[PDB]
Write a protein that binds this DNA or RNA. Structure first.
Ligand SMILES: [Mg+2]
Lengths: 62, 434, 513, 319, 226, 36
RNA sequence: UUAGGAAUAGUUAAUAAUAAUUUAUAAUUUUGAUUAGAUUGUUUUGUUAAUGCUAUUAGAUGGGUGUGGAAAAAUAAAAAAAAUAAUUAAUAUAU
């Protein structure tokens, strides 16, 4: 328990949690220009098990 | 040191011969550059090369831990190789954190020794002229950072004093100019055991004319005058250490008057037969030799027509041969060692016991030992890196003290060997004869 | 106030430089404030201090603040090995409670120093003293016909491969584990005495059962653990009805000797019958007179098998038992990722045409592009200095040679190749004689810390030594583009690490929904 | 934890295994080996019918004892059996030792045997401790024995809770070979103090002191006090005042002391240059040897008061 | 103060107690009022060793490529239910599966019925939020027969570990109001055969012999030996 | 103490120094120390 | 308190005025002000025949956080800090 509480920067070892603040805490100052755009055409494709079940449905319907 | 860029690692990407720092990369990234043979010098600030100097010396001891005697000799060889690559430029006043004349702030070890207002106004210029004597700006375009740190400590010894505690009573200070090895806390205790020995054995032995060999900073010479020895004379092969020691004897009051300092290799001249200087015979000859890690290990014999030993054993046999020509009858020699010759080199036999048992020129009159109480550097050559003694080596080291007299002077010291609680050899009991 | 003695002179105000706390935080790996771009493949050395390295700092050591996607570095931690005792519940007393769980790390070190005061025999410690019976009960399991020992070695290979990369098509695992040992015995048939290295699971002799439900414990009573290891340990299925292995994440690095057809010793050698080329002028004495180099054992002569231990399914924690030299061969994916990340950051942040100077640190106004080019050039110089280029089969990659000591922790990522060699001692080469000839004739003092090698178709198994303990962990997640674009280290200075390693990577919309 | 295996069952071998079965509350595993498998089965049954808190195994060969137990403790009868079991066997404990094993020998052996055992165990990688036991069999049953352990220091510190199960006084002599010498020095002092007490009471009867009960109370407060003087004096009073009375048979005999004292002259360096660099030791040895061949070997150590002058007989005639 | 331990007694600071008054010791912190609390570390942390080998899915991720097999979805729902139940039963997890949201039934903690402790809560109203495992519960507290006059908020109603026995006679529909259960002294007459008091004021439970043996072995009075 | 005018005590409130304990330092475990 | 002595001001009072849109011949200072320099004070120190000369080391601290009764809060060998941890003694610290 004391080894867990030692790794923070408390001055009096009083079982508090004081986190370290680095110089860059935001993504825009880390070189990332803007928010990442997800590929909406790639994530809306049908998965492989769904294609296999569609093939099984087309086999069993006829 | 002026670099030759054609023999460096990468003369195309770095045509200046070194890799500048800029204070951005990690310490282990610089440590990987130094281990491959690339020179490292700071680009902007002295803090970048000061942080690279402390961390590389700490990372090297983690890779090569001092586990036995053979691991300290390898670590001292590795640290001497790596710390020579950590350079600083010759014109250190063009760097940023050398001095700030408006904020009175500066980086470096000069803030441990000097004042903020005193350094940033007047002492940055006096240190600029202090380096020019030993390392001129023409011959040197770069300085090793260990030499830059030693120049800042030697400039402190030039500006103010250097107290020898607890050897000197708090007001007698010495000024070693440069290249003269001062004493640390570990280097003091072989002289602290000797000062207590000289306080009690002066008068029962009637010691008046003391001779000190290899004085260095003169700490062994000034310790004898405190115990009451009237005539002391020191011999030092360094000429600049002789001029500084005799100037400190004038500065240290009127109780250091009969102190003399001459330049000699080990002993005085003893060349003129017509002037007869042989009438000045000393009754106590003191020797406090230095024990470096490179000098304690490579002790071996060399020479065909003049076969001589090297290292610490060769320095002892120089002291054990020519001491009879300068000693009076009923006179003793005092040897101050620190037991590192037996710790760092345990396979070789004892060099002091090799003189007594085999050569049979000296008789062991007395022997004392005392364990080491403090920590610090041991026998530090000035322009090299600092290496403090580890804990497992510090607990087994002992400050020794060897008192020997002549084989011809057995009959005078015969009643000393007859007392209870003494160790007479088998040769001095045959000469007593009740 | 404080009582101060009055002086008629001026007062000295010292601003003396202390040991920098940022320096010991960067050395101990507990900084958590360094934003460092230009991810490289050079290994990082971390000296483990007292209570300064945990999972919180080791997670930032794996994934730095610059937005990394994969822990593509070998991490050497000096003195980071931990030893755990088995824990048990107390039936007696005032109630029921479990005690015994404790770590022997950072306080009981390996290789205690032997300093004493009295060709030449010195006293040293070459093996780890805590895990020495645990290595002994593994080495005695292979002690002895020869075919039973060969199928014992083939049956104990970790995952059927044992780290070796060999092409096997249309073959099951139990036949592949025999074919690898058959290939090693066919390769090592020509030499009189050679060796090879394998990964090996813990045998049945090293694990004993305890009645209380079912508790398996190690034979030596000590467990080699890493308290700063992040993630979950690797779960190995027992085959013999598939259940979990009780200590499957703890493996061994076995050195096996082949037959075909604590006292080091030092000697000082002499010779019978331009020095400093980096210095411009000539000196009366050399500034560095002697060199110190690491002595390694002899590799036998070399188609030829790969002989590289690659763990493609787990993260490796090497705990060495002897002084080893590990030659890491870098995979193509790590250097390709570092190259594309550095070039992406260079074309994003430095859009200036840079003026094309002579070298990078030339005279001129130090703009942002010049600072970035200088940092990239220093990173390339670090990569060129600490590595070498070898040949393959056609192939060429960076090889980093790492001196690993007993008590260290060598984190190896997945996909990294490495060859293992044993360090035999320490030599001293004077710089005067080495300027005229090779350093083999310039040897002055040689300490041999390993006096090992004795001298008493296919090949026969002679003996088995445990050179290192391999702690296998589950593969750490590789971040995507959107995960690395939104990864901020300041969100992980307190918590979120067990969620980072349990779930796949981090959340893309972490803490800004 | 660590597995414990005790080898050898005799008059002093069985209470060590009984105390190891008693004190180890299912924490350390117990294995039992002996010179015969029937004796090991008998002592395992004796441990099983009186209450066993831990599991115990029976073995007939040393190979399973080496491959199963990390700590091996031997308590054998003679030096030849220990030399056969430790070194001379094909399935030896030291010649087939595992790295990290701890082999303790409680047999009273020579110094060269302990030196060879420690050297071959250090070559195999194991740790050999020699700790000869001194005490009574009932004192071993009650848990009081004297052990002089020679070997490694950290191996001695690992073996302290195991040694404290059947012995109260366990001391570390230092390097191996010095633990087996302490018993030789102790029994040599026992023989010398016994001869000194016998001659002191002979001189007390010569001087005409009738009250010996107050004489021993004086001598115990003097500088010439010893435990053997307190031990033998009421028997020596009856043996001196009644010289025709035969001495009674005791547990410790003359041959039991001479079997240990016959190790010492083989363990000592060359004495023939001066022919006697140990006067009172051989002066007690000649009295013990004169008491042995006269028919009083199995009886008490106080029987040397009738052969005080016979120890002079090999001094006047051999010179 | 209003209620001190042993009156004013200050030979030690432990003689006052671990809290000086049942009221909050400062006016600005009303959360420091003395009340019965619940070990939320063991209770709110459910066993994550039932979700291994089970692919859970996020709420926002409704894209087609991230969808799973419906058998895998069903075993994920079973594993999530087993994860929510693995520590204990909530009030909102017991009242959802009851008629009329369990209004009128008696809920109780595990330690509320052992020893000489007797206390339950007759449920009156529950406001479920969108996360149906949480919310706000109300009820009449019954402690040793005596009952509150008004419904009080059930403290720690979100922490698991609750139990109830469903009785159809106690069920109150949403049209009517849940009546307060009667005080056994005041409202209904006192009958010893129906309800008998386990504890009363100035009463303390007798010493169990195993606790006496354990304390006398810990203090050293009885010869404890291995 | 009470069993089953001097004032008798309760044997549970006043325990009777249980006999399985051992005596470490007695009044006879002293020695004389002369100093001047 | 100043070896070479002159001006000072978020200013003084009144006020149905918290939070001053007003009134006044306003306030300090040659009986020494403000500013600048030196600056913790203090029958505790030293000396002497001395109501003389000469010394001082209790302390406090309008922007770090409106928290807390009170900012005194970035570091102090005890001031033992909510179950008798220990209360025989000496080192009580190095360790
Ligand atoms: Mg007005």
């Amino acid at each position: 328990e004391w080894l867990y509480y030692k790794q923070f920067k408390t001055v009096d070892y009083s079982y508090r949690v004081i986190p370290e603040l680095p110089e860059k805490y935001r993504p825009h100052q880390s070189g990332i220009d803007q928010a990442p755009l997800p590929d909406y055409r790639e994530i809306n494709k049908m998965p492989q098990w769904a294609e296999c079940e569609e093939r099984r449905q087309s086999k069993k319907t006829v | 040191i002026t670099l030759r860029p054609d023999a460096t690692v990468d003369p195309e990407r770095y045509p200046l011969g070194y890799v500048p720092l800029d204070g951005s990369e990690s310490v282990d990234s610089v440590w990987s550059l130094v281990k491959s043979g690339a020179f490292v010098a700071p680009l902007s600030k002295i803090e970048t090369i000061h942080r690279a100097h402390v961390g590389i010396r700490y990372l090297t001891q983690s890779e090569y831990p001092a586990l036995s005697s053979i691991d300290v000799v390898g670590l001292q060889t590795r640290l001497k190789e790596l710390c020579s690559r950590l350079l600083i430029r010759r014109d250190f006043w063009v760097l940023d954190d050398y001095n700030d004349p408006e904020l009175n702030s500066s980086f470096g070890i000069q803030n441990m020794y000097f004042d903020n207002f005193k350094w940033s106004q007047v002492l940055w210029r006096r240190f600029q002229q202090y380096v020019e004597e030993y390392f001129p700006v023409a011959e040197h375009t770069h300085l090793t950072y260990d030499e830059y740190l030693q120049l800042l400590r030697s400039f402190s010894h030039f500006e103010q004093g250097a107290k020898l505690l607890p050897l000197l009573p708090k007001r007698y200070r010495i000024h070693p100019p440069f290249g003269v090895p001062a004493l640390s806390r570990i280097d003091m205790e072989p002289l602290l055991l000797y000062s207590q020995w000289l306080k009690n054995f002066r008068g029962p032995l009637k010691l008046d004319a003391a001779l000190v060999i290899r004085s260095g900073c003169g700490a062994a010479v000034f310790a004898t005058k405190l115990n009451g020895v009237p005539i002391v004379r020191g011999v030092d092969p360094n000429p600049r250490a002789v001029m500084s020691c005799r100037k400190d004897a004038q500065r240290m009051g009127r109780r250091f008057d009969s102190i003399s300092f001459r330049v000699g290799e080990m002993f005085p001249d003893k060349d003129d037969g017509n002037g007869v200087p042989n009438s000045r015979k000393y009754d106590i000859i003191v020797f406090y030799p230095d024990q470096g890690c490179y000098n304690l290990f490579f002790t071996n014999a060399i020479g065909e027509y003049a076969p001589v030993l090297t290292g610490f054993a060769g320095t002892l046999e120089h002291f054990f041969e020519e001491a009879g020509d300068y000693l009076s009858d009923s006179g003793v020699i005092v040897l101050c060692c620190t037991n590192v010759y037996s710790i760092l080199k345990p396979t070789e036999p004892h060099p002091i016991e090799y003189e007594i048992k085999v050569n049979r020129r000296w008789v062991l009159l007395d022997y004392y030992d005392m364990p080491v109480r403090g920590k610090g550097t041991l026998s530090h050559t000035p322009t090299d890196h600092h290496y403090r003694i580890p804990m497992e080596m510090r607990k087994c080291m002992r400050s020794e003290l060897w008192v020997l007299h002549k084989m011809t002077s057995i009959a005078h010291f015969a009643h000393i060997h007859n007392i209870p609680g003494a160790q007479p050899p088998s040769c001095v009991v045959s000469h007593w004869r009740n | 106030r404080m009582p101060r003695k009055p002086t008629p002179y001026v007062r000295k105000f010292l601003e003396g430089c202390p040991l920098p706390e940022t320096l010991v935080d960067d050395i101990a790996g507990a900084n958590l404030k360094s934003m460092a771009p230009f991810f490289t493949t050079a290994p990082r050395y971390i000296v483990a201090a007292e209570s300064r390295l945990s999972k919180l700092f080791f997670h930032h050591a794996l994934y730095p603040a610059g937005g990394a996607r994969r822990p593509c570095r070998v991490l050497i931690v000096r003195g980071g090995r931990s030893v755990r005792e088995p824990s048990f519940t107390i039936n007696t007393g005032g109630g029921r409670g479990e005690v015994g769980g404790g770590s022997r790390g950072y306080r009981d070190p390996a290789r205690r120093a032997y300093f004493y005061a009295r060709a030449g025999l010195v006293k040293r410690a070459s093996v780890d003293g805590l895990l020495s019976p645990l290595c002994g009960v593994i080495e005695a399991h292979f002690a002895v016909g020869g075919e039973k020992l060969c199928v014992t070695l083939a049956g104990l290979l970790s995952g059927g491969h044992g780290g070796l990369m060999m092409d096997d098509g249309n073959c099951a695992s139990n036949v592949r584990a025999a074919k690898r040992v058959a290939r090693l015995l066919h390769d090592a048939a020509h030499h009189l005495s050679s060796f090879f290295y394998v990964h090996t699971q813990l045998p049945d002799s090293a694990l004993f059962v305890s009645r209380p439900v079912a508790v398996f414990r190690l034979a030596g009573g000590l467990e080699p653990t890493v308290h700063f290891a992040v993630g979950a340990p690797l779960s190995v299925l027992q085959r013999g009805s598939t259940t979990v292995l009780p200590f499957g994440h703890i493996q061994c690095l076995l050195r096996v000797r082949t037959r075909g057809g604590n006292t080091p010793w030092c000697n000082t050698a002499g010779n019978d019958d331009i020095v400093e080329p980096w210095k411009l002028g000539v000196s009366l004495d050399p500034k560095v007179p002697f060199f110190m180099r690491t002595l390694t054992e002899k590799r036998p002569s070399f188609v030829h098998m790969n002989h590289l231990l690659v763990r493609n399914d787990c993260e490796t924690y090497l705990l060495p038992q002897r002084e080893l030299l590990l030659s890491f061969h870098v995979p193509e994916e790590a250097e390709a990722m570092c190259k594309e990340q550095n070039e992406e950051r260079m074309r994003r942040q430095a859009a200036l045409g840079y003026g094309s100077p002579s070298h990078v640190f030339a005279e001129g106004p130090r703009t942002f592009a010049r600072v970035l080019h200088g940092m990239k050039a220093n990173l390339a110089a670090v990569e060129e200095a600490s590595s070498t280029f070898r040949q393959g089969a056609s192939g060429s990659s960076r090889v980093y040679e790492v001196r690993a000591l007993p008590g260290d922790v060598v984190f190896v990522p997945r996909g990294w190749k490495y060859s293992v060699e044993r360090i035999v001692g320490t030599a001293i080469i004077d710089a005067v004689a080495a300027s005229t000839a090779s350093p083999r004739e310039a040897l002055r003092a040689v300490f041999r810390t390993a006096p090992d090698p004795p001298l008493p178709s296919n090949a026969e198994i002679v003996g088995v030594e445990v050179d290192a303990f391999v702690l296998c962990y589950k593969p750490y997640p590789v971040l995507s583009n959107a995960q690395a674009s939104t990864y901020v280290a300041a969100n992980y200075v307190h918590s979120g690490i067990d969620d980072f390693y349990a779930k796949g990577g981090n959340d893309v919309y972490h803490k800004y929904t | 934890s660590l597995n414990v295996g005790v080898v050898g069952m005799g008059n002093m071998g069985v209470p060590i295994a009984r105390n190891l079965g008693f004190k180890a509350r299912s924490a350390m595993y117990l294995q039992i080996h002996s010179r015969a498998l029937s004796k090991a089965k008998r002592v395992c049954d004796d441990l099983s019918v009186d209450g066993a808190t831990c599991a115990m195994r029976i073995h007939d060969r040393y190979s399973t004892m080496t491959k199963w137990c990390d700590v091996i403790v031997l308590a054998l009868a003679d030096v030849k059996a220990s030399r056969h079991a430790l070194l001379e066997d094909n399935e030896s404990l030291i010649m087939n030792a595992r790295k990290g094993q701890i082999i303790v020998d409680h047999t009273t052996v020579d110094a060269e045997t302990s030196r060879e055992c420690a050297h071959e165990a250090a070559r195999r990688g194991a740790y050999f401790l020699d700790a000869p036991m001194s005490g009574s069999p009932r004192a071993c049953f009650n848990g009081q024995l004297l052990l002089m352990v020679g070997g490694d220091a950290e191996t001695f510190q690992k073996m302290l809770p195991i040694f404290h199960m059947y012995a109260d006084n366990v001391f570390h002599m230092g390097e191996s070979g010095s633990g087996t010498a302490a018993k030789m020095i102790s029994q040599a002092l026992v023989a010398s103090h016994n001869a000194a007490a016998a001659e002191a009471l002979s001189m007390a009867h010569a001087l005409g002191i009738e009250d010996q009960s107050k004489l021993v109370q004086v001598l115990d407060a003097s500088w010439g006090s010893s435990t053997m003087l307190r031990r033998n004096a009421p028997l020596l009073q009856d043996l001196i005042r009644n010289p025709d009375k035969t001495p009674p048979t005791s547990a410790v005999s003359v041959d039991r002391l001479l079997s240990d004292l016959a190790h010492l002259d083989a363990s000592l360096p060359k004495r023939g240059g001066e022919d006697e660099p140990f006067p009172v030791f051989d002066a007690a040895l000649r009295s013990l040897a004169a008491a042995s061949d006269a028919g009083m070997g199995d009886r008490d150590l106080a029987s040397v008061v009738h052969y005080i002058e016979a120890g002079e007989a090999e001094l006047r005639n051999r010179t | 103060r209003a209620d001190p331990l042993n009156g004013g007694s200050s030979m030690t600071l432990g003689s006052k107690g671990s809290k000086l008054s049942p009221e909050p010791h400062r006016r600005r912190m009303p959360w420091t009022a003395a009340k019965e609390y619940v070990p939320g570390v063991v209770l709110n942390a459910r066993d994550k060793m039932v979700l291994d080998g089970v692919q859970l899915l996020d709420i926002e991720s409704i894209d087609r490529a991230s969808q799973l097999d419906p058998l895998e979805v069903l075993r994920a729902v079973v594993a999530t239910r087993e994860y929510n139940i693995s520590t204990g039963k909530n009030i909102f997890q017991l009242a959802s599966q009851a008629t009329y949201n369990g209004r009128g039934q008696r809920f109780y903690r595990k330690e509320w019925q052992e020893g000489t402790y007797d206390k339950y809560v007759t449920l009156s109203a529950i406001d479920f939020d969108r996360d149906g495992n949480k919310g706000t519960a109300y009820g009449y507290i019954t402690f040793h027969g005596e009952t509150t006059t008004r419904p009080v908020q059930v403290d720690f109603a979100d922490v698991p570990g609750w139990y109830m026995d469903f009785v159809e006679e106690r069920a109150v529909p949403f049209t009517g109001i849940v009546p307060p259960p009667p005080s056994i002294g005041t409202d209904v007459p006192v009958d010893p055969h129906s309800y008998r008091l386990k504890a009363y004021p100035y009463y303390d439970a007798p010493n169990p012999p195993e606790f006496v043996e354990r304390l006398l072995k810990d203090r050293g009075v009885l010869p404890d030996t291995p | 103490r009470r069993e089953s005018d001097p004032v008798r005590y309760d044997p549970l409130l006043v325990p009777r120094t249980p006999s399985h304990w051992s005596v470490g330092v007695d009044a006879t475990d002293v020695r004389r120390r002369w100093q001047i």
